[PDB]
Amino acid sequence: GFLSGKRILVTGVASKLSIAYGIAQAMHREGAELAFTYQNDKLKGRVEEFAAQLGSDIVLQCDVAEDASIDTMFAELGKVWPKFDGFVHSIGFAPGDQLDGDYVNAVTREGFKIAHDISSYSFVAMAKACRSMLNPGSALLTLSYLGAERAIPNYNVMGLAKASLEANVRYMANAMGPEGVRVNAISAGPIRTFRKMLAHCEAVTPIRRTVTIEDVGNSAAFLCSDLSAGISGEVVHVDGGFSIAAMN
Amino acid sequence: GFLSGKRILVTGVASKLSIAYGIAQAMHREGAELAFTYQNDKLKGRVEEFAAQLGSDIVLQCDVAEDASIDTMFAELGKVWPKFDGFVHSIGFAPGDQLDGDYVNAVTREGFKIAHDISSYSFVAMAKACRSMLNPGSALLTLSYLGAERAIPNYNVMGLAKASLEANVRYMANAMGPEGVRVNAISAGPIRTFRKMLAHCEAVTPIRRTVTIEDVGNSAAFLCSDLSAGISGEVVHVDGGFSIAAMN
Amino acid sequence: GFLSGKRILVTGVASKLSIAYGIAQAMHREGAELAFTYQNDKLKGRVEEFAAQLGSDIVLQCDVAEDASIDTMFAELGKVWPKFDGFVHSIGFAPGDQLDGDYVNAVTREGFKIAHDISSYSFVAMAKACRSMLNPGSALLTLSYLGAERAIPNYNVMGLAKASLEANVRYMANAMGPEGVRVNAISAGPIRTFRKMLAHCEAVTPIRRTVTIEDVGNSAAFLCSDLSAGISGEVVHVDGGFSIAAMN
Amino acid sequence: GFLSGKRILVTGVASKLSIAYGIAQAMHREGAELAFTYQNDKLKGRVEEFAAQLGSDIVLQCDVAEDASIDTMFAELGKVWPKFDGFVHSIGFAPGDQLDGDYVNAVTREGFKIAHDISSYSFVAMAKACRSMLNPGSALLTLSYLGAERAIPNYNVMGLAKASLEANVRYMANAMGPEGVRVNAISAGPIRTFRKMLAHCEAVTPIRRTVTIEDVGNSAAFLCSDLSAGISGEVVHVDGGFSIAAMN
Ligand SMILES: NC(=O)c1ccc[n+]([C@@H]2O[C@H](COP(=O)([O-])OP(=O)(O)OC[C@H]3O[C@@H](n4cnc5c(N)ncnc54)[C@H](O)[C@@H]3O)[C@@H](O)[C@H]2O)c1
Ligand SMILES: NC(=O)c1ccc[n+]([C@@H]2O[C@H](COP(=O)([O-])OP(=O)(O)OC[C@H]3O[C@@H](n4cnc5c(N)ncnc54)[C@H](O)[C@@H]3O)[C@@H](O)[C@H]2O)c1
Ligand SMILES: NC(=O)c1ccc[n+]([C@@H]2O[C@H](COP(=O)([O-])OP(=O)(O)OC[C@H]3O[C@@H](n4cnc5c(N)ncnc54)[C@H](O)[C@@H]3O)[C@@H](O)[C@H]2O)c1
Ligand SMILES: NC(=O)c1ccc[n+]([C@@H]2O[C@H](COP(=O)([O-])OP(=O)(O)OC[C@H]3O[C@@H](n4cnc5c(N)ncnc54)[C@H](O)[C@@H]3O)[C@@H](O)[C@H]2O)c1
């Protein structure tokens, strides 16, 4: 495929519905050699299976809240992949309490801190830890959501974390571009990984249907291939034109 | 390729350096059946050659300033392609006088009128004329430039025409999305189709080089394939991250 | 008031409901000396009567569709205001059939030409005709609408013209800054100058209410006073936060 | 003045050069009654002396890094202003080493945590602590910078925090609108509160000059007065049009 000859690390695969899962399927399909990570033991075995399917037996543990964990994982990965071509950052989180009800009432210093640390900082923490291992022409990818650009009910602090992550994409792209590395994001429309949210999106979205992990996977597979060589620091909307419409 | 089974019309191919040329090369490479148009006789024979190379002997005349010319061309095209899957709108123009020196002094009512008619209206004029001939899953594509979002010296009225064209993309996408048609644009970085402009871009661009018709072609080939099924109404920047940087 | 010493030309007063009307009162209240224009024989009386109430007796005819009408009006104005400090451009028009139903079917080459000419080109045309009459410290202001950034049902081709207009604001600001002129736009929320539109807006609007011609007028007075000396080429949203919200 | 009747809290006054300082004078000039805060023992004297010159004797300590410090300060304020009409948030900080050199190498998990906490979270933290003390018609204002939208050399992690901050502005506006509170930000151009930066800016800036704390103060006074009743969740650019220009 258009990813033949590329070595790509994929984080965040927690189930067959996970966006990261849809992305690995498509990159594999296009011939990329894959490697996966898992947040903790409770998910290992399970992530080892997905990897076997995509011709990969590279399954490493990594918690992004810890630098030591990130470095340790890239050390292992380094054993089988002294060099590689980028990674898919598909990690997101905020304390349950943070995402419901009035934003100003829900947000807490700690809530803000964790959501920004896990959802935004982990992206450059990861680039930071593997920077000398990336080949020229490598590409990094992360996932955002429209809640970064607009105020969406309940999305609350996760919206500030995503605005931060989107800016992280421009700064990472600007600093890593000179050594042949591109960095972008995909702002996905809602995907079940609410039933109302999804109903709504569907009727108001230009393409008249919510997008899928397959739709996102192909966009990610392309954004991490040399096909998108002229694109860096971009937040591509793969939400069927939802954000560009109004009052449908 | 990822365009096998798609029938795509390509306008604006005026030479081997034309963006439209770079786009046809890539769509052909990916297996799309192509068809070309030419503004006038002075370019026919020449455009008939490019077409033969890309396995196409469908070369039709079409001046977008005339509805009759657009309808007549789609009538011919209809003879060999009763249905097809979209087109690449790679047309741009403004009276020479309009693009140099102070904007407020250069712009003229006529200058404004022509630049907006040829660069922006011709895009939906074309969708309008072939709308019943598009298959489900079709995709339309046009080309814009950063001058639509920011005030660039000398670009003058062409910048208002491109802002118009970018908005045209959202409205066309919003109206045609329900019948399975997506519409997007690619805002390309500067491409020689100045020597200073290009010098500058190159040093300040994240990827440290100006983009190419090949880089744009692959992005266009992807945006017109089902790979980008979840993307509509978007202006993708294929300028190496130039617009997202500042003061490099 | 903060506009004392300021001589500003105001266009587009058609009724006490008119946005240009709320703007003229606001500016008058803050001490500006005003001059008015009226499009034709039908509006002359209404405009003369308002100019009188606002303490003005400069009531000049002007059809921005015509360069000659623009020059003649400014020659008239210059006999009483050899120099003045800017003008409000509150003009808008698209042929009746352009604004209802599917965008691509409603739009036509002529409907497009006129919407852009009247709604966008007329702004810089006026700036051209009076460029040498503006004191440094002058400010030009126009009015746009969210339809310029999102695809809004039925706004159709007016969305494209507004987009062309907002770019005009950027190019005119960049061109005229060196001589002490600022150029901005207010992107106002909908105002009854639909019943459902206004009904939808009010509940999903951050400030929980549609904006009034008093809100737009006060922001207009600000954007044309020395208070906004540091703001130029900006599109200020005065829609109660409507556009920065989503899925409310 | 247009702020008579208004009681506003101003944070971040550190010197006569301070932006919060130009803002306090401007607001004072327009008739606002002010209250001030100072971060620590080192700034208390300077702040007391300015409060005196601006006719105020409410000078309270507050370290936004601490929730308790925020509550205590508002309990102090409430004894003299049971209700007031908003506050200016002009606070910013990132550890010394964060702002120079390559972005990815300079950033660290701690430098990131602190920049976001102090520069972004503190805004809503203050809004939390005093939410019930705001009269309807209140306005909250903060200060951002273009580094939030473009990747700007050396601004590094502060760009991510500002981005998080501007989204905060949107989420706080959407949350507090229903109770009559507006929330906005001024994205100011650079001010000496570098010599080359300022040198570059001035020549490529539309208004041909860097902005002053008087320009930012007048726009601040406006954004916190009833004059801006129709503006909420907006990021107003007060940079002389710098950001809407390119390749100047
Ligand atoms: N589902 C949607 O509607 C949607 C839409 C747009 C964007 N996104 C974004 O896509 C990304 C993936 O989300 P998803 O919908 O696939 O959900 P998901 O639960 O399937 O995947 C997210 C991953 O977060 C990982 N994670 C959490 N904390 C971690 C830590 N401390 N260390 C390492 N890994 C950790 C988990 O292992 C998990 O697999 C997120 O950034 C999310 O914000 C989701
Ligand atoms: N070259 C750059 O630096 C650059 C960068 C970004 C975007 N673009 C855009 O890409 C598009 C293609 O430009 P290009 O650089 O390939 O130049 P080009 O000259 O190679 O192609 C543009 C085409 O305009 C066509 N044209 C003009 N009037 C026409 C009419 N009345 N009817 C039918 N066709 C007509 C010509 O046939 C010509 O081939 C334009 O819209 C341009 O604005 C160019
Ligand atoms: N009403 C709203 O809800 C709303 C919302 C957002 C933006 N706007 C914008 O504000 C501006 C004013 O609109 P309005 O609602 O006050 O409408 P309006 O009908 O009250 O006034 C607009 C004016 O356009 C003038 N005009 C039209 N063609 C002209 C020509 N050829 N020459 C000279 N004058 C001409 C008319 O005399 C008229 O008074 C427009 O640009 C509009 O797009 C209106
Ligand atoms: N100076 C510029 O060119 C410029 C340009 C654009 C935006 N800004 C923004 O304007 C705001 C003001 O910056 P400035 O240039 O006036 O700098 P400044 O040093 O004059 O003032 C900022 C204030 O931050 C306060 N502060 C820091 N940590 C604090 C804490 N933990 N608790 C309480 N107070 C604390 C300090 O007392 C200080 O007075 C910032 O948010 C900055 O990012 C400045």
Side-chain angles (χ1 to χ4, degrees), chain A residues 1-194 197-248, chain B residues 1-194 197-248, chain C residues 1-194 197-248, chain D residues 1-194 197-248:
Chain A
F2 54 77
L3 279 169
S4 285
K6 287 294 188 180
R7 269 169 168 162
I8 304 291
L9 177 62
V10 184
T11 76
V13 179
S15 79
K16 325 70 194 183
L17 312 170
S18 289
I19 281 169
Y21 185 92
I23 297 183
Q25 296 196 120
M27 302 189 131
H28 175 59
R29 179 196 77 230
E30 297 301 320
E33 271 180 59
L34 304 176
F36 303 61
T37 68
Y38 55 98
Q39 183 181 347
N40 54 65
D41 310 318
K42 165 154 167 54
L43 270 50
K44 195 189 181 185
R46 3 304 277 178
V47 178
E48 303 178 293
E49 281 139 40
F50 307 156
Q53 293 164 44
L54 304 171
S56 170
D57 65 329
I58 298 174
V59 188
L60 316 173
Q61 186 284 311
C62 177
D63 185 343
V64 288
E66 301 288 3
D67 296 357
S69 181
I70 293 174
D71 289 329
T72 279
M73 179 279 276
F74 276 124
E76 290 298 318
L77 174 65
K79 289 171 171 181
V80 59
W81 283 2
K83 285 270 187 163
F84 64 107
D85 316 280
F87 59 87
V88 178
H89 176 268
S90 194
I91 294 163
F93 183 68
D97 33 296
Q98 301 296 122
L99 304 205
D100 270 302
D102 176 285
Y103 165 59
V104 165
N105 291 324
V107 72
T108 65
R109 199 170 292 267
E110 258 300 277
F112 173 110
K113 187 283 197 181
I114 290 163
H116 278 79
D117 183 59
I118 303 305
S119 311
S120 175
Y121 181 71
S122 66
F123 186 40
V124 62
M126 285 195 69
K128 210 176 158 48
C130 74
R131 190 174 194 185
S132 64
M133 301 171 63
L134 297 164
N135 287 310
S138 308
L140 301 201
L141 182 72
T142 185
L143 279 143
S144 190
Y145 181 56
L146 182 65
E149 309 160 56
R150 322 261 228 289
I152 298 166
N154 307 302
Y155 200 59
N156 301 355
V157 74
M158 207 37 237
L160 291 54
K162 291 304 193 186
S164 178
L165 176 66
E166 291 198 2
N168 203 177
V169 168
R170 304 184 272 284
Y171 278 88
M172 287 170 56
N174 187 248
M176 309 193 271
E179 69 221 42
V181 179
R182 296 177 297 106
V183 191
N184 304 281
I186 279 178
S187 186
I191 300 183
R192 26 162 227 181
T193 70
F194 208 93
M197 180 174 259
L198 256 44
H200 177 70
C201 259
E202 210 176 357
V204 286
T205 302
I207 62 168
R208 293 289 185 285
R209 83 179 172 59
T210 40
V211 314
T212 74
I213 62 171
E214 277 71 43
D215 291 317
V216 179
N218 284 324
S219 279
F222 157 77
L223 290 167
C224 290
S225 95
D226 292 312
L227 287 178
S228 64
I231 305 168
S232 202
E234 190 99 335
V235 181
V236 183
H237 293 82
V238 185
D239 65 350
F242 179 83
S243 74
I244 60 77
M247 298 177 110
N248 292 168
Chain B
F2 54 77
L3 279 169
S4 285
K6 287 294 188 180
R7 269 169 168 162
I8 304 291
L9 177 62
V10 184
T11 76
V13 179
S15 79
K16 325 70 194 183
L17 312 170
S18 289
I19 281 169
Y21 185 92
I23 297 183
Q25 296 196 120
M27 302 189 131
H28 175 59
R29 179 196 77 230
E30 297 301 320
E33 271 180 59
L34 304 176
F36 303 61
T37 68
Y38 55 98
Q39 183 181 347
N40 54 65
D41 310 318
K42 165 154 167 54
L43 270 50
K44 195 189 181 185
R46 3 304 277 178
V47 178
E48 303 178 293
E49 281 139 40
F50 307 156
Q53 293 164 44
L54 304 171
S56 170
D57 65 329
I58 298 174
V59 188
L60 316 173
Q61 186 284 311
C62 177
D63 185 343
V64 288
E66 301 288 3
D67 296 357
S69 181
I70 293 174
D71 289 329
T72 279
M73 179 279 276
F74 276 124
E76 290 298 318
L77 174 65
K79 289 171 171 181
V80 59
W81 283 2
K83 285 270 187 163
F84 64 107
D85 316 280
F87 59 87
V88 178
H89 176 268
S90 194
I91 294 163
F93 183 68
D97 33 296
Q98 301 296 122
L99 304 205
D100 270 302
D102 176 285
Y103 165 59
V104 165
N105 291 324
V107 72
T108 65
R109 199 170 292 267
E110 258 300 277
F112 173 110
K113 187 283 197 181
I114 290 163
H116 278 79
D117 183 59
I118 303 305
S119 311
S120 175
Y121 181 71
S122 66
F123 186 40
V124 62
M126 285 195 69
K128 210 176 158 48
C130 74
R131 190 174 194 185
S132 64
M133 301 171 63
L134 297 164
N135 287 310
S138 308
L140 301 201
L141 182 72
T142 185
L143 279 143
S144 190
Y145 181 56
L146 182 65
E149 309 160 56
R150 322 261 228 289
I152 298 166
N154 307 302
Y155 200 59
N156 301 355
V157 74
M158 207 37 237
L160 291 54
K162 291 304 193 186
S164 178
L165 176 66
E166 291 198 2
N168 203 177
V169 168
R170 304 184 272 284
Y171 278 88
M172 287 170 56
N174 187 248
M176 309 193 271
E179 69 221 42
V181 179
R182 296 177 297 106
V183 191
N184 304 281
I186 279 178
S187 186
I191 300 183
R192 26 162 227 181
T193 70
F194 208 93
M197 180 174 259
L198 256 44
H200 177 70
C201 259
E202 210 176 357
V204 286
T205 302
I207 62 168
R208 293 289 185 285
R209 83 179 172 59
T210 40
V211 314
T212 74
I213 62 171
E214 277 71 43
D215 291 317
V216 179
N218 284 324
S219 279
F222 157 77
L223 290 167
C224 290
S225 95
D226 292 312
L227 287 178
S228 64
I231 305 168
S232 202
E234 190 99 335
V235 181
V236 183
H237 293 82
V238 185
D239 65 350
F242 179 83
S243 74
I244 60 77
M247 298 177 110
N248 292 168
Chain C
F2 56 80
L3 278 168
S4 297
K6 299 291 201 180
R7 277 167 167 188
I8 298 169
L9 176 70
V10 185
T11 71
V13 166
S15 73
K16 213 173 208 299
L17 264 31
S18 281
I19 280 184
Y21 179 67
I23 290 181
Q25 303 188 310
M27 291 188 161
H28 168 67
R29 183 197 74 231
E30 292 307 329
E33 265 176 42
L34 311 180
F36 299 76
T37 59
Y38 56 102
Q39 177 176 196
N40 44 30
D41 293 328
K42 174 186 171 56
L43 269 34
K44 184 185 183 176
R46 178 62 78 170
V47 182
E48 293 184 308
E49 174 48 38
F50 289 151
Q53 295 170 35
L54 287 199
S56 183
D57 80 323
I58 306 180
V59 173
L60 310 163
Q61 185 277 157
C62 182
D63 179 328
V64 295
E66 311 278 26
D67 285 356
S69 185
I70 298 171
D71 294 324
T72 294
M73 180 276 304
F74 281 124
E76 268 190 303
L77 182 71
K79 227 59 200 317
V80 52
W81 281 5
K83 300 245 173 199
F84 56 116
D85 309 277
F87 62 80
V88 169
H89 172 274
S90 175
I91 296 197
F93 182 73
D97 277 337
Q98 293 299 120
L99 304 217
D100 79 292
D102 170 285
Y103 166 60
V104 181
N105 294 336
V107 79
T108 63
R109 195 177 301 265
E110 252 300 286
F112 171 111
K113 197 283 302 183
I114 297 174
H116 286 75
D117 181 68
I118 301 288
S119 321
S120 175
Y121 182 71
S122 61
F123 190 39
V124 63
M126 277 176 84
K128 264 181 166 293
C130 74
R131 187 170 196 170
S132 84
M133 294 169 72
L134 305 166
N135 294 317
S138 296
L140 305 190
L141 175 72
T142 191
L143 285 92
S144 193
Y145 173 65
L146 177 60
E149 318 174 68
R150 317 292 182 58
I152 299 191
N154 298 298
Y155 199 60
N156 308 327
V157 83
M158 268 305 303
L160 284 66
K162 287 305 195 188
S164 161
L165 176 62
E166 291 183 13
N168 204 183
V169 162
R170 291 184 288 283
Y171 280 89
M172 285 161 58
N174 190 254
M176 304 172 79
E179 55 229 47
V181 182
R182 289 178 299 111
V183 180
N184 301 290
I186 282 186
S187 179
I191 302 169
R192 172 162 149 67
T193 61
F194 206 89
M197 193 171 274
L198 260 34
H200 175 65
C201 259
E202 271 183 60
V204 291
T205 300
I207 61 171
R208 289 294 175 279
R209 87 175 165 70
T210 54
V211 302
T212 56
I213 60 171
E214 281 66 52
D215 301 318
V216 176
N218 289 320
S219 291
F222 168 78
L223 294 180
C224 294
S225 70
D226 285 324
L227 296 172
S228 57
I231 300 173
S232 190
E234 188 79 345
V235 180
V236 179
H237 297 84
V238 182
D239 68 342
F242 176 77
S243 91
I244 56 77
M247 287 173 104
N248 256 171
Chain D
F2 56 80
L3 278 168
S4 297
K6 299 291 201 180
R7 277 167 167 188
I8 298 169
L9 176 70
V10 185
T11 71
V13 166
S15 73
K16 213 173 208 299
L17 264 31
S18 281
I19 280 184
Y21 179 67
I23 290 181
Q25 303 188 310
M27 291 188 161
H28 168 67
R29 183 197 74 231
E30 292 307 329
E33 265 176 42
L34 311 180
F36 299 76
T37 59
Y38 56 102
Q39 177 176 196
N40 44 30
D41 293 328
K42 174 186 171 56
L43 269 34
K44 184 185 183 176
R46 178 62 78 170
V47 182
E48 293 184 308
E49 174 48 38
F50 289 151
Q53 294 170 35
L54 287 199
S56 183
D57 80 323
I58 306 180
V59 173
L60 310 163
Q61 185 277 157
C62 182
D63 179 328
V64 295
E66 311 278 26
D67 285 356
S69 185
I70 298 171
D71 294 324
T72 294
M73 180 276 304
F74 281 124
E76 268 190 303
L77 182 71
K79 227 59 200 317
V80 52
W81 281 5
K83 300 245 173 199
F84 56 116
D85 309 277
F87 62 80
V88 169
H89 172 274
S90 175
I91 296 197
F93 182 73
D97 277 337
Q98 293 299 120
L99 304 217
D100 79 292
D102 170 285
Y103 166 60
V104 181
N105 294 336
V107 79
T108 63
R109 195 177 301 265
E110 252 300 286
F112 171 111
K113 197 283 302 183
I114 297 174
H116 286 75
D117 181 68
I118 301 288
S119 321
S120 175
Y121 182 71
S122 61
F123 190 39
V124 63
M126 277 176 84
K128 264 181 166 293
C130 74
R131 187 171 196 170
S132 84
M133 294 169 72
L134 305 166
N135 294 317
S138 296
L140 305 190
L141 175 72
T142 191
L143 285 92
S144 193
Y145 173 65
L146 177 60
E149 318 174 68
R150 317 292 182 58
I152 299 191
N154 298 298
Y155 199 60
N156 308 328
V157 83
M158 268 305 303
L160 284 66
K162 287 305 195 188
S164 161
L165 176 62
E166 291 183 13
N168 204 183
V169 162
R170 291 184 288 283
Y171 280 89
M172 285 161 58
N174 190 254
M176 304 172 79
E179 55 229 47
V181 182
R182 289 178 299 111
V183 180
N184 301 290
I186 282 186
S187 179
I191 302 169
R192 172 162 149 67
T193 61
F194 206 89
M197 193 171 274
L198 260 34
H200 175 65
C201 259
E202 271 183 60
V204 291
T205 300
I207 61 171
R208 289 294 175 279
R209 87 175 165 70
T210 54
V211 302
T212 56
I213 60 171
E214 281 66 52
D215 301 318
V216 176
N218 289 320
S219 291
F222 168 78
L223 294 180
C224 294
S225 70
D226 285 324
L227 296 172
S228 57
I231 300 173
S232 190
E234 188 79 345
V235 180
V236 179
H237 297 84
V238 182
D239 68 342
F242 176 77
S243 91
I244 56 77
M247 287 173 104
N248 255 171

